Design a protein around this ligand. Structure first.
Ligand SMILES: *[C@@H]1O[C@H](CO)[C@@H](O[C@@H]2O[C@H](CO)[C@@H](O)[C@H](O)[C@H]2NC(C)=O)[C@H](O)[C@H]1NC(C)=O
Ligand SMILES: *[C@@H]1O[C@H](CO)[C@@H](O[C@@H]2O[C@H](CO)[C@@H](O)[C@H](O)[C@H]2NC(C)=O)[C@H](O)[C@H]1NC(C)=O
Ligand SMILES: N#Cc1ccccc1Cn1c(N2CCC[C@@H](N)C2)nc2ccccc2c1=O
Ligand SMILES: N#Cc1ccccc1Cn1c(N2CCC[C@@H](N)C2)nc2ccccc2c1=O
Ligand SMILES: N#Cc1ccccc1Cn1c(N2CCC[C@@H](N)C2)nc2ccccc2c1=O
Ligand SMILES: N#Cc1ccccc1Cn1c(N2CCC[C@@H](N)C2)nc2ccccc2c1=O
Ligand SMILES: *[C@@H]1O[C@H](CO)[C@@H](O)[C@H](O)[C@H]1NC(C)=O
Ligand SMILES: *[C@@H]1O[C@H](CO)[C@@H](O)[C@H](O)[C@H]1NC(C)=O
Ligand SMILES: *[C@@H]1O[C@H](CO)[C@@H](O)[C@H](O)[C@H]1NC(C)=O
Ligand SMILES: *[C@@H]1O[C@H](CO)[C@@H](O)[C@H](O)[C@H]1NC(C)=O
Ligand SMILES: *[C@@H]1O[C@H](CO)[C@@H](O)[C@H](O)[C@H]1NC(C)=O
Ligand SMILES: *[C@@H]1O[C@H](CO)[C@@H](O)[C@H](O)[C@H]1NC(C)=O
Ligand SMILES: *[C@@H]1O[C@H](CO)[C@@H](O)[C@H](O)[C@H]1NC(C)=O
Ligand SMILES: *[C@@H]1O[C@H](CO)[C@@H](O)[C@H](O)[C@H]1NC(C)=O
Lengths: 724, 728
């Protein structure tokens, strides 16, 4: 008789239980007490007691066991930087001796730490330089002497590489047996700085000015170098010698990126490079030479990947999966029909043969063994929004087994997977449409060992609450399927008219209509406020082939915007939608599209909310922006850069109720972007509503800020919909 | 029919439907003034033809922001390419036109980006400041003499003020003072080397790809203040063979003892200049009197001549120590100081003496000395009918202080009770400006016979337009608290019914020496709210307000955010007790200090106010500037007043905001009250889970004065108020 309230969402009354494991062998894995588990039986017992480090003094944020299990690294003093980057203090614990190591310790304010893949070698980054420890208690060797704050990054990424290329702070790649440590070096000397105020605590008298080298569209980019150093032959008397691997000649002719690093074998590494115009990428295969101690990347072994219709990869070229001998690999590339499928490449020839095909896409290669290739795709039922684990037989490609399709077809249609070190076991994670379900399997016969978490605890509670449902479906548009989803209020009556809120992202390769179960803001709006919240994947959206995804190439703020308006038009004709009460909201790219929609003059939407929106593409970073827009120069794409601003649509905002929200310490979509929107609206005399968030960044993710923002939006929406 | 059906609408206010006409004039002699096409109106007769046709600069190729005529009337100075900096400071291009040779001077032109230019008071000598250095031209077509060589952007200022001196001390960018016949050029020089910078984003036009970080040396409470030196150069002994020699005048020993300020410069004669210095603890000030020694070519401030002004109740002066007005021989002066009773009156000082003698007395105050001849002293005060919010011109006989004549009191007693005055070069004529309660009125007067010569502007065009519109009225009265009178005003809706219950907006400033209850006629936002929206908008001068003596004014000394806050709440309680207020609909708004008082009121937990708007509020006194803040608050050190610094933040009241509806407005490019202060307020309301309305103004400053921004904020505020009061 009670509903899922805003408070329920904000305080997580109804917790979604996870089951996070970290494999350590081919049949064992860890689980947070921190106990070990057996995939076979489930026996053993404990690894570390709930409070053995009670007498540490500091509060432990995370742990990391060495591969051989002889040492555990303890992380504390965590200071977040950007999305993936941060700073921490570290101590190492000898698991055998049962004592904290106190000689030659890892320094304070360490940027990144990593074990070698086998054994207990250690590499860390401090003050933008790389250090190596053969043994946890011996003096570390300094690898690099060039690291300078905001200027040179050794073994760590700068702003743009962090956010837009590697989705990681780390730029260190150990060879499979720990012999070689490969790293990248970024140079930002000439990359312009973004500056913004950070007000900080009330005690701070004068505001701090934050500075980060951040390349906006068409600006000077960071340059990148790639090195490889031999850790087995490290000298405590002479400096470490780093062999450089230069980019291919087809890359060195202009600005370029390093977009992938993947070790093939103990003495072979693959590198992928991307031109600044992101429609051409090359893969180098580099072997270690013992006569010279150098690395050779045969020009004949280069593999080219390009696109005539758009950019390469979903957000970057796919990563290769090497056969053990490293003379072959599989990777996802789009076929001649434009659908992303798995291609098999032989190291010493031009042609690859495709091993999957059809009008659906492979999402990822999960593991490869001697006999089988494992991958997740949206093939099941032609639904782009589902995800199932498949097995393909290497000796015969037509022999394909769906390992998750029928495990529970009603409650489970969206899977991810985690395989053991050698793929003998795998954990399946099901994310919807029913409550999440975590199961454990043996890959020898593909039967299920046991249920790891079934979420019945949560299921019991949701029995008493009036919950919304999800409709997943498509509309036909120009002889093409476009998918949408709806969070429908409980006791849904299709003869009554409901206010509708369009929830938008709609960036390139986005997908907002899927089979995932979520407890979120939409959930409360549906449950308590009886609002329908819909999402739509129009042109530019992903996992439906290049025809749809590349439709907005060089033309951002066009078709994907038009299609959201059309979706709304379509939902009005569904009969149960009150077309005097349609609203639209989105974050980031979604804030942009919401703003573009509201300023289009369509008359379809009464109101909207844009959170941290891009307002004009020259303000956003090069890597993301240029992938879709090219350069903002007269000989490239300036005209569309100038045409696709939200500012230029300010006059049409007179027709709608607008709320614009932005965190003042947004390193990503700079406050600048909203500042220019508000200025344009003021300049044409449009009244609207605003909210800044002091020192909040792109996430607006502080516990209190998070609560304030969703509360503020609730009132705005409820006000727009005449809801008390 | 023919009954008034129109009201004074928001559009009327924003679009300037009903315009007040002014009468701006500039005296050039003791019997002639200029006015706009430029005409040299004659005060007596009137035979006065065009001085400059409006077309005379058609061929210029730049728009002319402003003009200035040399005292001798031989040259005109054309100001163009004006670019605003702070409240008074700006940058402009200049060109000089020869008013006799009828052409532009093309040789040795004044440079672009000039910070200040100024004619000598006689002849046509010129002093300008460029790149922070002073330059002099004896003749407009001749090369400049460089006076200073030490000018450095943001560090060394010669002849111009820095941020805080501009805003809080001189109310001007200029720091140059010519001697009466233009022989000497006196100047201040400021040193900001160690003064910390405020930094903030300036977004600029949308074509700017990367935001700009503006930085300005800006001393917050207790921070390292700028230092100041003072010099005098003889402009007649300038040479194009040697660098100009500037004679430093040092500060008195009592000031050099710690952090001090230059707070006043006034020439007495051709060879005598008076300085006033102020201690950082602004309760002690010293006037020096410096005579030019003819043989050595130096300046001498004799220790015996030093005049000390102080206070044991608060600070000295209303905002700074008052300015002296010297007699012709320079052996004597008159200035406004507070008496034994705490009231500010004109004291008469002899140079070679200790104690002065008060020429005025009473339970009122002198507002300003306006002119002194050898026979009469002219001043404005609020004596008439004991109305602190009134203003009249008075004339006291120098030889008999019992002979005081009001010159403006009865000219028009009904439409006119608030006057200012503009005297001719030697006070033979004066223009009177009446600013209310009726429509503004401008008249011209001969001071020999005191009778009126002519009506300059009577605003009859405006009076015509108003005949048909239901305008509000004003209630100016007082209430008694602790047997002390405290004045309020109410802007009352047309057809005011004392038997009805109106919603009330409390319009607040309430900072030290503020006055919000007066006799001035105004066409503002409040006019619309009353006329169109039927909201009573009231204002109240409680403890801390000025023009009523140190007893009221110093009541909040060292205790900012206490009584003035408490008095605004009590005022609302009195208004509701008056029987015509709906106490379910009482709001409050303010700008600057009034933003702070609003915030403190809305966080008081009083229960009296439903909603409020703070525009560019102070949130915590450590964020605001040293000169204004330390005047009332002392230093934020443990051994001074830090305790009350920490106790008077709006942040610490955040919890109480759950009871009110709050709109918080601030311009992002505000160099005065930094955006910082509202950003700290919002973070605090966010931390205690309070919902509120916000609005930033991109690139606007403390004024939010851009045409479009101005219209936007008042439209936005109107919505919020109408919402709060359930008005359709
Ligand atoms: C990082 O890149 C910068 C920018 O090119 C390099 O700086 C140049 O270095 C050379 C040799 O020292 C100088 O002649 C140039 O004048 C420098 N340019 C600028 C603008 O600083 C720098 O060498 C690179 N850093 C490293 C070690 O890779
Ligand atoms: C402005 O004031 C600063 C002090 O804040 C002066 O700096 C000093 O200059 C002297 C003389 O050159 C040096 O000996 C000192 O090292 C400086 N001290 C400090 C504290 O910086 C500066 O010279 C002054 N500028 C002018 C031209 O008046
Ligand atoms: N910038 C800056 C800055 C300026 C003055 C003193 C200290 C710092 C350090 N710093 C910071 N930098 C860390 C070093 C690399 C640099 N690009 C960013 N980033 C942020 C970000 C958010 C809140 C605070 C800070 C911060 O204090
Ligand atoms: N962030 C960001 C951002 C900002 C401005 C324009 C576009 C984007 C892209 N983007 C996004 N990722 C895209 C892949 C690289 C990763 N950096 C960000 N993720 C999500 C997630 C949820 C809702 C919107 C978005 C989104 O717009
Ligand atoms: N700051 C700065 C700055 C930074 C980079 C280039 C140019 C300038 C000049 N400048 C400026 N300064 C003028 C010189 C004295 C200095 N304190 C302030 N103040 C403001 C203020 C508001 C909007 C723009 C500007 C501006 O461009
Ligand atoms: N400005 C400002 C400001 C900012 C923060 C706190 C206090 C003040 C004082 N003040 C003010 N002047 C006072 C004399 C020095 C001059 N700089 C400002 N003028 C007006 C005018 C109208 C409404 C409020 C105010 C006001 O609060
Ligand atoms: C459980 O596994 C542990 C792993 O070390 C093994 O030693 C033990 O024999 C097993 N115990 C039982 C009772 O199954
Ligand atoms: C890290 O910093 C803390 C506090 O300043 C200090 O006590 C400790 O010795 C440091 N640890 C290392 C490994 O440098
Ligand atoms: C790791 O690989 C290197 C390079 O091929 C090789 O020399 C070494 O024997 C390997 N180490 C071990 C112990 O497997
Ligand atoms: C890459 O993009 C540019 C600009 O859109 C285009 O002219 C060029 O033909 C493309 N190159 C390839 C390899 O398709
Ligand atoms: C200005 O007016 C006076 C007074 O009537 C008159 O005598 C005089 O001739 C006029 N000035 C000239 C010379 O035009
Ligand atoms: C001022 O600037 C304009 C345009 O740059 C130029 O023509 C003129 O000569 C300049 N004047 C001086 C004296 O610097
Ligand atoms: C004037 O003073 C400056 C700086 O002190 C010096 O550089 C300049 O040469 C002097 N002028 C002359 C030529 O006397
Ligand atoms: C102005 O005053 C100075 C100093 O008293 C004096 O020497 C000079 O003669 C005066 N100038 C004129 C033109 O009377």
């Amino acid at each position: 008789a009670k509903t899922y309230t805003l408070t329920d969402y904000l305080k997580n009354t109804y917790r979604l239980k996870l089951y996070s494991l970290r494999w350590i062998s081919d049949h064992e894995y860890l689980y947070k007490n921190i106990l070990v588990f057996n995939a076979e039986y489930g026996n053993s017992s404990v690894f570390l007691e709930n409070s053995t480090f009670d007498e540490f003094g500091h509060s432990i944020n995370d742990y990391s066991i060495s591969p051989d299990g002889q040492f555990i690294l303890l992380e504390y003093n965590y200071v977040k930087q950007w999305r993936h980057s941060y700073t921490a203090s570290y101590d190492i614990y000898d698991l055998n001796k049962r004592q904290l190591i106190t000689e030659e310790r890892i320094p304070n304010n360490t940027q990144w730490v990593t074990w070698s893949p086998v054994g207990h070698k250690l590499a860390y980054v401090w003050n933008n330089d790389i250090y190596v420890k053969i043994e946890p208690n011996l003096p570390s060797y300094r690898i690099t002497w060039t690291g300078k704050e905001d200027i040179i990054y050794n073994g760590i990424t700068d702003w743009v590489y962090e956010e837009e290329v590697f989705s990681a702070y780390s730029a260190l790649w150990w060879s499979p047996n720990g012999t070689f440590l490969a790293y990248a070096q970024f140079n930002d000397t000439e990359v312009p700085l973004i500056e913004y105020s950070f007000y900080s605590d009330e005690s701070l008298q004068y505001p701090k000015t934050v500075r980060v080298p951040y390349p906006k569209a068409g600006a000077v980019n960071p340059t990148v170098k790639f090195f490889v150093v031999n850790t087995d032959s490290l000298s405590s008397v002479t400096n470490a010698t780093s062999i450089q691997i230069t980019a291919p000649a087809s890359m060195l002719i202009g600005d370029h990126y390093l977009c992938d690093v993947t070790w093939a074998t103990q003495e072979r590494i693959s590198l992928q490079w991307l031109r600044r115009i992101q429609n051409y990428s090359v893969m180098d295969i580099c072997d270690y030479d013992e006569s010279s101690g150098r690395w050779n990347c045969l020009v004949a072994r280069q593999h080219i990947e390009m696109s005539t219709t758009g950019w390469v990869g979903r957000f970057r070229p796919s990563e290769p999966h090497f056969t053990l001998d490293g003379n072959s690999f599989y990777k996802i590339i789009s076929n001649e029909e434009g659908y992303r499928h798995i291609c098999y490449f032989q190291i010493d020839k031009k042609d690859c043969t495709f091993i999957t095909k059809g009008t659906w896409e492979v999402i990822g290669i999960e593991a490869l063994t001697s006999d089988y290739l494992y991958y997740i795709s949206n093939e099941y039922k032609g639904m782009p929004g589902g995800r199932n684990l498949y097995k393909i037989q290497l000796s015969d490609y037509t022999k394909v087994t769906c390992l998750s399709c029928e495990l529970n077809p009603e409650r489970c249609q969206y899977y991810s997977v985690s395989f053991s070190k050698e793929a003998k076991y795998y954990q399946l994670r099901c994310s919807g449409p029913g409550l999440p379900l975590y199961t454990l399997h043996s890959s020898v016969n593909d039967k299920g060992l046991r249920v790891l978490e079934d979420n019945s605890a949560l299921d019991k509670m949701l029995q008493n609450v009036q919950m919304p449902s999800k409709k997943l479906d498509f509309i036909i548009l120009n002889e093409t399927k476009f998918w949408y989803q709806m969070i429908l209020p409980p006791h849904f009556d299709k003869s009554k008219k409901y206010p509708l809120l369009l929830d938008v992202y709609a960036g390139p390769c986005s997908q907002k209509a899927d089979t995932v179960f979520r407890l979120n803001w939409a959930t409360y709006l549906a449950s308590t406020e009886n609002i329908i919240v819909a999402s739509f994947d129009g042109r530019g959206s992903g996992y439906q082939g290049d025809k749809i995804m590349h439709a907005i190439n060089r033309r951002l703020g066009t078709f994907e915007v038009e299609d959201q308006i059309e979706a709304a038009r379509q939902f009005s004709k569904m009969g149960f939608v009150d077309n005097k009460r349609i609203a639209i909201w989105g974050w980031s790219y979604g804030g942009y599209v919401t703003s573009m929609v509201l300023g289009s003059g369509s008359g379809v939407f009464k109101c909207g909310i844009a959170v941290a929106p891009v307002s004009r593409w020259e303000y956003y970073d090069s890597v993301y922006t240029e992938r879709y827009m090219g350069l903002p120069t007269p000989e490239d794409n300036l005209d569309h850069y100038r045409n696709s601003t939200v500012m230029s649509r300010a006059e049409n905002f007179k027709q709608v109720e607008y709320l614009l929200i932005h965190g003042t310490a947004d390193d990503n979509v700079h406050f600048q972007q909203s500042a220019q929107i508000s200025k344009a609206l003021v300049d044409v005399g449009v009244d609207f509503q605003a909210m800044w968030y002091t020192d909040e960044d792109h996430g607006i993710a502080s516990s209190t800020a998070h609560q304030h923002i969703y509360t503020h939006m609730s009132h705005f929406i409820k006000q727009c919909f005449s809801l008390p």
